[PDB]
Design a protein around this ligand. Structure first.
Ligand SMILES: [Ca+2]
Length: 665
């Protein structure tokens, strides 16, 4: 009935487990934030310092030409200055948490100067405002894939909600690195993953509740085509002069000196002006520049004492983008299509994504939608919600709204990917779910596109006079259509699909029966032009041999996951082919070996039983500092889908501790 007793820390300490996951215990909130900053510095200090240096607008100054483009971009959009403003505009209690986090990073570096790379030492000390700037850059001035599931009690065997956290970002891009951690104070507990440098956990759960995120592509900014005339720009039939402001920055030279570079910032009524290569003057207008509370909003959301508290925090509209999914031990699940969306009187999403006329107040929006204007689903009749980056039109099944219920500029009405179709199928078709079964369904790696095309392609290919084309057809026909390590037909099938549906597998032109929202998990279907498709198979056969050495190389012999000296077989594949579990394989090297560019990173599954039970893995480990043993130590488990029990209970943490860091704050 009531959740288990909350632990009351009596001293400040980090207890590290065998995978480099910090469990940070603080006697108050600022102590916990300090421990967290320390931990992030230990695990990811070099890259965090680099990113903070950038968000300062000092990339060019610290590291030179390779960082200049970002510096100009951030200074033109006023990022470092606005961050100072946002910092001052924080509530006093939350500002103190940001200060403690920064102090934690500084203290780590001070105590361990040998762990900080020479190039990023000049960044120190860091400040609460540096923290705010990085978050500002990440959310506003930086598409990524993810899956998300929440399952209501009545859909489960035990009667407790289930939650999947499953973001698919790059395995290399530094600011997209996820980090796993656990924070405990007398007043709250949070477990989960977040991007390095963020002082709040974005993929969080505790004994009461949890949330996950996916990219919705919230159209938060407008690009306005300006009509230049007589030194200014035409607007409402009149010539307006630009606002002009002289700035400057330092650029590091090869000889270690810096050089002063002038930067003129021009602005129209819309916002700062950029000149494109072709000569088009474009004004960029970003919504939600006046929303300083995004970090505190996430923090209040994840530490909410009830669903009502959660929703009230969400409704602050300080988080500019993202689909957000929620579940709790009380049994509530919710999907929210979130972000800061301008109110507009006309135009669909395509109009607002292109260049909008910058010559008229007709297109100058000034207000944004409250939470209640955006697509949301709570405790639907189907007993689940999902999003796999599909437009928000099948977040549950049966649906609870249609496209007509919302302004046409909020979200597209384009065909749902085969991954998103699988997502809906896997939840809706299963009842009486256990955590074990939930996890088994997460591993789904079906070549759904093969189900949609092979029935037409095979017989067409078998009538080709080329015996090699015939052999390829039989190879494809014998395939179980799963992306398993041992599959001899999967690589060939991918190569054919690159032609049939484009290099991203999203092309629609080749199906016989087009996608339809009336049949949203069984269209598109069929091969429109079978003879043409056979010609594509012919080309694909040559492509497969060239890339991999044969038409029947085992999928997991070519597809490997390789970190340090760990090299294990791959399984699952591209989302747009229908694989739910995603590994976006790179192009092969000269030996036909390829690895994930993006895909599964932080993967966690939580049952809100009492106490909660949760399992997870992090593909690229919990640290990327040179010399760490916690980079390649999880990938072998990933290759066998061997998830770790995630440990939130004090006795569990104490039994797993491999390193103890007492701290003072
Ligand atoms: Ca050390």
């Amino acid at each position: 009935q009531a959740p288990i007793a909350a632990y009351k820390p009596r001293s400040n300490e980090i207890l590290w487990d065998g995978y480099g996951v910090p469990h940070i215990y603080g006697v108050d909130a600022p102590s916990a934030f300090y421990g967290y900053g320390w931990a992030q510095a230990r695990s990811h200090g070099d890259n965090i310092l680099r990113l903070y240096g950038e968000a300062r607008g000092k990339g060019a100054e610290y590291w030179g030409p390779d960082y200049e483009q970002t510096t100009v971009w951030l200074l033109t959009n006023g990022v470092p200055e606005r961050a100072q403003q946002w910092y001052a505009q924080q509530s006093p209690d939350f500002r103190a948490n940001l200060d403690a986090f920064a102090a934690g990073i500084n203290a780590y570096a001070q105590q361990n100067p040998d762990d900080i790379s020479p190039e990023v030492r000049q960044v120190l000390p860091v400040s609460g405002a540096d923290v705010v700037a990085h978050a500002h850059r990440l959310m506003n001035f930086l598409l990524g894939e993810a899956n998300s599931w929440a399952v209501a009690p009545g859909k489960t065997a035990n009667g407790n909600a289930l939650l999947l956290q499953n973001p698919h970002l790059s395995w290399t891009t530094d600011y997209f690195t996820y980090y796993e951690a656990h924070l405990v104070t007398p007043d709250f507990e949070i477990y989960g993953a977040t991007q390095i440098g963020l002082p709040v956990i974005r993929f969080a759960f505790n004994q009461r509740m949890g949330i996950t995120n996916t990219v919705n592509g919230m159209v938060g900014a407008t690009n306005y085509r300006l009509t230049l005339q007589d030194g200014g720009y035409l607007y409402d039939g009149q010539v307006r002069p630009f606002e002009r402001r002289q700035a400057s920055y330092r650029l590091r030279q090869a000889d270690g000196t810096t050089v002063d570079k002038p930067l003129e910032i021009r602005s129209s009524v819309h916002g700062p002006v950029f000149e494109r290569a072709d000569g088009t003057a474009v004004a960029v207008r970003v919504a939600g520049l006046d929303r300083p509370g995004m970090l505190e909003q996430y923090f209040d959301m994840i530490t909410a004492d009830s669903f009502d508290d959660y929703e009230a925090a969400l409704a602050r509209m300080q988080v500019p983008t993202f689909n957000i999914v929620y579940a709790d031990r009380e049994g509530t699940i919710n999907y929210s299509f979130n972000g800061v969306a301008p109110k507009r009187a006309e135009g669909d999403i395509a109009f607002w994504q292109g260049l909008v006329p910058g010559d008229s107040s007709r297109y100058l929006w000034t207000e944004t939608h409250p939470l209640d204007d955006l697509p949301r689903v709570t405790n639907p009749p189907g007993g689940f919600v999902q999003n796999s980056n599909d437009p928000p039109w099948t977040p549950t099944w049966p649906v609870t709204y249609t496209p007509k219920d919302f302004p046409s500029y909020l979200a597209p009405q384009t065909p749902h990917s085969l991954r998103a179709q699988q997502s809906v199928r896997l939840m809706s078709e299963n009842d009486d779910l256990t955590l074990e079964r939930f996890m088994a369904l997460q591993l789904s790696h079906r070549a759904v596109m093969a189900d949609r095309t092979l029935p037409d392609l095979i017989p067409a290919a078998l009538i080709d006079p080329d015996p090699e084309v015939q052999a390829a057809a039989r190879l494809l026909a014998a395939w179980d259509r799963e992306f398993t390590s041992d599959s001899r037909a999967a690589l060939l099938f991918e190569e054919w699909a690159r032609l049939f549906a484009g290099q991203n597998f999203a092309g629609q032109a080749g199906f016989a029966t087009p996608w339809s929202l009336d049949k949203p998990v069984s269209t598109p279907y069929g091969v429109r032009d079978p003879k043409a498709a056979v010609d594509q198979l012919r080309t694909a056969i040559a492509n497969t041999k060239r890339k991999y050495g044969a038409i029947d190389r085992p999928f997991g012999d070519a597809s490997r996951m390789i970190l340090n000296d760990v090299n294990v077989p791959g399984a699952a594949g591209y989302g747009n082919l229908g694989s739910f579990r995603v590994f976006t394989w790179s192009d092969p090297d000269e030996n036909g070996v390829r690895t994930p560019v993006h895909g599964e990173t932080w993967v966690a599954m939580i049952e809100f039983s009492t106490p909660v039970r949760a399992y997870g893995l992090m593909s690229y480990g919990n640290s990327r500092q040179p010399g760490t043993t916690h980079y390649s130590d999880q990938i072998e488990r990933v290759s066998r889908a061997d998830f770790r029990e995630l440990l939130l209970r004090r006795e569990q943490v104490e039994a797993a501790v491999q390193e103890r860091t007492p701290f003072n704050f």
